[PDB]
Amino acid sequence: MSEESQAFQRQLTALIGYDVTDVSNVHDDELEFTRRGLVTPRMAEVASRDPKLYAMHPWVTSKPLPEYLWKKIANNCIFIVIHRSTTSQTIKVSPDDTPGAILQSFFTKMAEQDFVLRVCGRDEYLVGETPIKNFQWVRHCLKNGEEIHVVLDTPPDPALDEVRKEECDRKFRVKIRGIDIPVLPRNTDLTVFVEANIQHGQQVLCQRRTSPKPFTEEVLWNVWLEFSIKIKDLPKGALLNLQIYCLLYYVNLLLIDHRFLLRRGEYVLHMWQISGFNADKLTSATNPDKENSMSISILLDNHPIARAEMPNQLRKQLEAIIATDPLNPLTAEDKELLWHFRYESLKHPKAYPKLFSSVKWGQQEIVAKTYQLLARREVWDQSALDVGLTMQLLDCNFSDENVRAIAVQKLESLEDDDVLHYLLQLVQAVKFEPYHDSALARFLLKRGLRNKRIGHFLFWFLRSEIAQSRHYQQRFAVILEAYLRGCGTAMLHDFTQQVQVIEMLQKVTLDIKSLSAEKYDVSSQVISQLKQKLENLQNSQLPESFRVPYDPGLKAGALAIEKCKVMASKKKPLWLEFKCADPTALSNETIGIIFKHGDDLRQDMLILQILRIMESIWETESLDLCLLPYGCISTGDKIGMIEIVKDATTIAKIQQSTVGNTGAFKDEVLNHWLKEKSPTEEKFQAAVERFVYSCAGYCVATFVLGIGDRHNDNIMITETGNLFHIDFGHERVPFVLTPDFLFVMGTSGKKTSPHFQKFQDICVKAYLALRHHTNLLIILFSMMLMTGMPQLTSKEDIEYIRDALTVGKNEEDAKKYFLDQIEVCRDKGWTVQFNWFLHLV
Numbered sequence: 001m002s003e004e005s006q007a008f009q010r011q012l013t014a015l016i017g018y019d020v021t022d023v024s025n026v027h028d029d030e031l032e033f034t035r036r037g038l039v040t041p042r043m044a045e046v047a048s049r050d051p052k053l054y055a056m057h058p059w060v061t062s063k064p065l066p067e068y069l070w071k072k073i074a075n076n077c078i079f080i081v082i083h084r085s086t087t088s089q090t091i092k093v094s095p096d097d098t099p100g101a102i103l104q105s106f107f108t109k110m111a112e113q114d115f116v117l118r119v120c121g122r123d124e125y126l127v128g129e130t131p132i133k134n135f136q137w138v139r140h141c142l143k144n145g146e147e148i149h150v151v152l153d154t155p156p157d158p159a160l161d162e163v164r165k166e167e168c169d170r171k172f173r174v175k176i177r178g179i180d181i182p183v184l185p186r187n188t189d190l191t192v193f194v195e196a197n198i199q200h201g202q203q204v205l206c207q208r209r210t211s212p213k214p215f216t217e218e219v220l221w222n223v224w225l226e227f228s229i230k231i232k233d234l235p236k237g238a239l240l241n242l243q244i245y246c247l248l249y250y251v252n253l254l255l256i257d258h259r260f261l262l263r264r265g266e267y268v269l270h271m272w273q274i275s276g277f278n279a280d281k282l283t284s285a286t287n288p289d290k291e292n293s294m295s296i297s298i299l300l301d302n303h304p305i306a307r308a309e310m311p312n313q314l315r316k317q318l319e320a321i322i323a324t325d326p327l328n329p330l331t332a333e334d335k336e337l338l339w340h341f342r343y344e345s346l347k348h349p350k351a352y353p354k355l356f357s358s359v360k361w362g363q364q365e366i367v368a369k370t371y372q373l374l375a376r377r378e379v380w381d382q383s384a385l386d387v388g389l390t391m392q393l394l395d396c397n398f399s400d401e402n403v404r405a406i407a408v409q410k411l412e413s414l415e416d417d418d419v420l421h422y423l424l425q426l427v428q429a430v431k432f433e434p435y436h437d438s439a440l441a442r443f444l445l446k447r448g449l450r451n452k453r454i455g456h457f458l459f460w461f462l463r464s465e466i467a468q469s470r471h472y473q474q475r476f477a478v479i480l481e482a483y484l485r486g487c488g489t490a491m492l493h494d495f496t497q498q499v500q501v502i503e504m505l506q507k508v509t510l511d512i513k514s515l516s517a518e519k520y521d522v523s524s525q526v527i528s529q530l531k532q533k534l535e536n537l538q539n540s541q542l543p544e545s546f547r548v549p550y551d552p553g554l555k556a557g558a559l560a561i562e563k564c565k566v567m568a569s570k571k572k573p574l575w576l577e578f579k580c581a582d583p584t585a586l587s588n589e590t591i592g593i594i595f596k597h598g599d600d601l602r603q604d605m606l607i608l609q610i611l612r613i614m615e616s617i618w619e620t621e622s623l624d625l626c627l628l629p630y631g632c633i634s635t636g637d638k639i640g641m642i643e644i645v646k647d648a649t650t651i652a653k654i655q656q657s658t659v660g661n662t663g664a665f666k667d668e669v670l671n672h673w674l675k676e677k678s679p680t681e682e683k684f685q686a687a688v689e690r691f692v693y694s695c696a697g698y699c700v701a702t703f704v705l706g707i708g709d710r711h712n713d714n715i716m717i718t719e720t721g722n723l724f725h726i727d728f729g730h731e732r733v734p735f736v737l738t739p740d741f742l743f744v745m746g747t748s749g750k751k752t753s754p755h756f757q758k759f760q761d762i763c764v765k766a767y768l769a770l771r772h773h774t775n776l777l778i779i780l781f782s783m784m785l786m787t788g789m790p791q792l793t794s795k796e797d798i799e800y801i802r803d804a805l806t807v808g809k810n811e812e813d814a815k816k817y818f819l820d821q822i823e824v825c826r827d828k829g830w831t832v833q834f835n836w837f838l839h840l841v
């Protein structure tokens with residue numbers, strides 16, 4: 001290698017937070033073979049990307065402008081405001097105009113074309129052949145009552161993005177030699193055995209057990225477990241899953257390796273413990289903690305895989321199976337039906353997930369017939385893209401690489417607008433891949449190299465997982481390293497700045513927790529220590545400026561130390577505020593960020609992103625629900641950052657006004673609060689209208705996800721009427737519609753009014769509109785639980801969103817379901833709100 005060629009790698013190791021060159025925790029060479037594998041997909045994407053459009057990364061959509069934004073143009077004329085140091089003219093522009101064309105109506109409208117329209121305040125450009133209607137920044141301004149302010153400066157140089165030069169019919173059998181752990185102690189002595197499973201996509205093909213033996217710190221069986229499955233009948237992606245019961249430990253081993261070879265030889269595998277189903281259970285990884293883990297010891301000593309029309313009455317039996325939801329379990333009779341009529345099931349793309357479940361993967365001849373099936377893929381290829389259907393095929397139920405590859409194909413037709421909607425969940429879906437190198441891993445590599453925005457979020461998603469998941473940190477680390485070797489030095493410099501900042505502040509965050517009592521109030525001495533510490537960073541430590549991880553447009557600047565504080569409450573988070581580092585910004589307002597150790601922010605990332613998916617769904621049906629799904633990025637273990645929505649107060653603090661007698665509650669307070677923060681009555685009626693959409697928006701979304709039983713403390717509202725929930729980390733009421741919310745709507749329990757008629761309307765409008773995407777939400781929710789929670793019931797927890805999206809029902813019945821739910825919040829009123837307080841003391 002070279003001298004500075006190793007300084008590059010230690011730069012990579014610091015942005016990843018993991019050493020990919022390490023081999024202390026591998027029993028073969030898959031990860032290093034996957035570093036080499038991905039060089040090609042990287043150099044292909046890097047080489048065929050437009051340098052100019054990659055530097056400016058225009059954020060752009062092909063979808064139609066919604067109905068609720070075409071009304072904000074009653075005139076077919078939109079207002080842009082081009083700038084230059086001081087002076088700045090206003091240019092009249094029809095929505096169908098184009099970046100090039102609105103420089104033609106500027107220079108010619110005065111009485112050389114190597115200038116560019118950058119946005120005031122941000123690293124966001126309006127460029128490339130697209131209508132201004134079809135730029136996201138523009139749509140964001142039209143949606144807010146804001147006006148499009150734009151500065152005119154020289155394009156960023158592609159030079160700064162330059163990437164550096166790179167560099168048998170025998171049955172299967174396994175001897176369980178024995179297990180071994182340095183120290184086990186609990187209290188009483190029990191017995192112990194080892195269970196061995198040939199597993200393919202959460203489907204046991206075959207299972208044998210050892211005799212039991214007394215659980216000493218070394219148990220030796222020296223026993224062959226002879227299976228029934230033949231070596232030829234083993235499918236690629238099958239896992240030998242070794243588990244210990246007395247269920248205390250587990251570990252997996254791909255029986256067929258990344259090079260198609262059958263697995264052979266001696267293996268001492270270090271095992272994962274079970275904390276007192278999920279995606280950690282499927283991992284080919286081994287416990288890196290060698291000094292404290294249990295270890296199994298085994299031996300393989302066993303290469304491979306080298307007309308007629310239906311009676312109308314069965315067809316209806318088959319169609320009814322195909323109509324059902326992704327969780328409705330398939331009977332043996334259902335599966336045999338799907339499979340006997342493979343070719344008719346193949347005419348329906350929605351049948352695919354259920355059809356490839358009906359395959360017996362533990363038979364060689366039937367897999368080979370399945371590959372014959374996939375070969376004539378004329379209807380699947382021609383069909384319209386279904387994201388939920390595609391996602392279904394990338395979940396834990398499918399480990400066949402070609403089943404999974406036909407799904408990733410469908411994804412390649414997604415534009416960047418849609419990739420960013422599902423990026424986090426596609427990254428979590430890499431946990432379900434049997435092999436480190438996979439079509440999905442390379443799809444993400446490709447899409448983040450092609451677009452800096454996707455590239456940026458791909459970084460923080462991968463880095464989130466690497467930092468807090470031993471089960472998948474090695475794999476993701478190899479994926480991330482591939483990305484950082486191709487994103488170009490402009491972005492590598494950007495990431496280095498961000499990683500430096502957030503490691504400075506998480507230092508300050510955890511150092512502040514300790515000094516303050518476990519819980520009581522805030523020391524005067526602690527507010528002194530926070531100021532001193534941030535004045536000691538501000539000077540000779542902190543970057544002049546850093547990109548805001550959750551909003552990569554905004555470049556934060558120096559700290560506004562006067563407005564920074566420790567937060568009086570839940571695990572001493574840092575309320576930090578920053579100056580904006582761009583001097584063409586049209587505002588003196590600060591970038592607010594909270595830094596919190598304590599809560600599992602991965603869970604918030606996940607709920608917030610589903611919230612953004614529900615916003616885009618409502619886009620397809622001309623509905624806006626005013627949701628404020630703010631930025632939140634997990635950066636490590638029970639730690640991360642959060643976006644501070646400006647001018648927002650907690651609904652509980654609005655009721656603490658005076659006294660707040662450990663739980664006094666009063667109906668009319670919210671409405672009076674909304675009129676104080678309104679200078680006019682005109683802006684107050686604009687706030688109530690905002691509260692009707694926002695309250696309705698979080699009401700529906702929260703019922704669907706089953707996170708609607710919440711304290712007033714975890715629900716906020718802006719000075720301008722926009723309600724929103726916060727903090728999604730882990731008698732009943734389906735959602736929060738307290739009597740105070742209804743008094744804004746002009747209704748005090750068991751009555752109706754014009755504003756409440758609007759709310760009821762908007763709710764069912766939103767509830768029916770989400771049900772048109774039932775399969776999407778069921779499958780995202782199911783995946784959310786598997787990759788983003790503790791241990792869960794792979795039937796029972798998911799079954800909520802079935803009953804909540806009232807599956808199998810007609811539209812009328814559904815409207816009734818949700819309207820009953822409103823009348824449960826109006827029957828109980830303050831009962832459940834009051835109930836928080838009572839438990840405590």
Ligand SMILES: CS(=O)(=O)N1CCN(Cc2cc3nc(-c4cccc(CO)c4)nc(N4CCOCC4)c3s2)CC1
Nearest residue numbers: 566567568599604632642643644645648650726727728
């Ligand atoms: C005395 S005090 O210190 O001045 N004071 C007391 C009252 N609080 C209330 C708040 C609590 C809270 N919690 C989270 C949070 C917590 C965990 C996870 C998540 C992520 O989903 C968000 N996020 C918040 N946001 C700030 C506004 O923008 C939205 C985010 C808030 S605001 C302000 C601080």
